[PDB]
């Protein structure tokens, strides 16, 4: 089942920011921060999973603080933690923390 990935990250520079789960199979894409430094996230991803031998639970989620595809970026990061779910679903949450104002909350959900 696809994993739904959603939430927001704040305190970013305007533009495109690389958005990855650490390790294999983790290149989620990018988030786009507006003129206020706020990036809304709403992604569906059928490559990642919240269960099985390649579950992303306990892996680190990162966002590049440097905008664009350039080198030498610092990261905001947080560990993907288990959240309590209702029947037939798995849920997880990563609390991202970086430098200065960079912070966010990203939710993950997958039907069981």
């Amino acid at each position: 089942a696809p994993v739904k990935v959603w939430g927001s990250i704040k305190g970013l520079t305007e533009g495109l920011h690389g958005f990855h789960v650490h390790g294999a199979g983790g290149d989620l894409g990018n988030v786009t921060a507006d003129k206020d430094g706020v990036a809304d996230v709403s992604i569906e991803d059928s490559v990642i999973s919240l269960s099985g031998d390649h579950s992303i639970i306990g892996r680190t989620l990162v966002v590049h603080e440097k905008a664009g595809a350039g080198a030498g970026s610092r990261l905001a990061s947080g560990v993907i933690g288990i959240a309590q779910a209702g029947a037939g679903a798995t849920k997880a949450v990563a609390v991202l923390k970086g430098d200065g104002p960079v912070q966010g909350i990203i939710n993950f959900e997958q039907k069981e």
Side-chain angles (χ1 to χ4, degrees):
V3 178
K4 311 307 170 62
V5 182
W6 69 276
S8 67
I9 310 171
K10 312 195 176 195
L12 293 166
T13 55
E14 185 178 3
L16 205 76
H17 296 267
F19 186 50
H20 311 139
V21 180
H22 181 70
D27 199 324
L28 304 186
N30 301 280
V31 304
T32 300
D34 65 21
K35 61 180 143 74
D36 297 328
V38 177
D40 285 325
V41 181
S42 183
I43 292 169
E44 181 178 316
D45 191 330
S46 283
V47 170
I48 68 184
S49 187
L50 304 185
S51 56
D53 54 29
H54 286 106
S55 170
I56 65 176
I57 299 300
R59 294 187 195 171
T60 298
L61 182 65
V62 306
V63 57
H64 283 221
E65 290 178 336
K66 190 166 194 292
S73 178
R74 299 187 301 172
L75 307 175
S77 67
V79 180
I80 298 169
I82 296 164
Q84 169 170 114
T90 301
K91 301 180 202 301
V93 182
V95 176
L96 300 169
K97 183 68 170 57
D99 304 295
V102 180
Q103 56 87 195
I105 296 179
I106 299 296
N107 301 304
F108 298 82
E109 302 179 42
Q110 185 183 32
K111 177 144 281 174
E112 208 167 21

